[PDB]
């Protein structure tokens, strides 16, 4: 169980293991990339052709 | 690590230290001990477990 409680992949579990073991996590850029990936996954789970159809309706 | 080798074999030695890189033995030991602790804590009712800890 992670902070959000979702079932982590074993790779993420080992990443958490090693981060706890060394006493420190990833860098700032890596954290930004991870949160961007999480936001992208959340947006994909929540789901652009309607706008295209509306635009194509006009000649 | 805890792999005993008889006779120096450079290929096996380098392959083993690649596989067990970054304290992998300690990592798997910590993983198994944490999994055991969590499992014991989850079913602590029927086991009459008062304290389930690990030494230093």
């Amino acid at each position: 169980v992670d902070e959000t409680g979702r079932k982590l992949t074993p790779k993420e579990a080992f990443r958490q293991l090693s981060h706890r073991f060394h006493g420190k996590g990833s860098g700032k850029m890596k954290t930004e990339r991870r949160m961007k990936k999480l936001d992208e996954e959340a947006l994909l789970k929540k789901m652009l052709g309607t706008v295209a159809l509306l635009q194509e309706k006009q000649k | 690590t805890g792999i005993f080798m008889h006779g120096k074999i450079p290929t096996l030695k380098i392959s083993l230290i690649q596989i067990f890189r970054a304290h992998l033995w300690q990592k798997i030991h910590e993983s198994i001990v944490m999994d055991l602790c969590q499992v014991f804590d989850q079913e602590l009712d029927a086991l009459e477990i008062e304290t389930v800890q690990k030494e230093t």
């Binding site: 169980v1 | 910590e30 230093t56």
Partner: peptide, 22 residues
Amino acid sequence: NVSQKRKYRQYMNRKGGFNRPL
């Protein structure tokens, strides 16, 4: 059925004690 977060020991780069904290 729920599982509380799992803690771990930071043995690496820890000068607080020779033995791992518990």
